[PDB]
Amino acid sequence: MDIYVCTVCGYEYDPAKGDPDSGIKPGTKFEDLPDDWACPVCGASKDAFEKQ
């Protein structure tokens, strides 16, 4: 359940929530996000995220 944070805008990727609008069901670990996943708030790449 490791939380990751967008270094661009501060949005938190919370695996317990997932990201349904990008086809990411609740419980999806950060490292199981596709590399084309983007921050919902600011649009930055997955690879702009760091562990909280």
Ligand SMILES: [Fe+3]
């Ligand atoms: Fe962001």
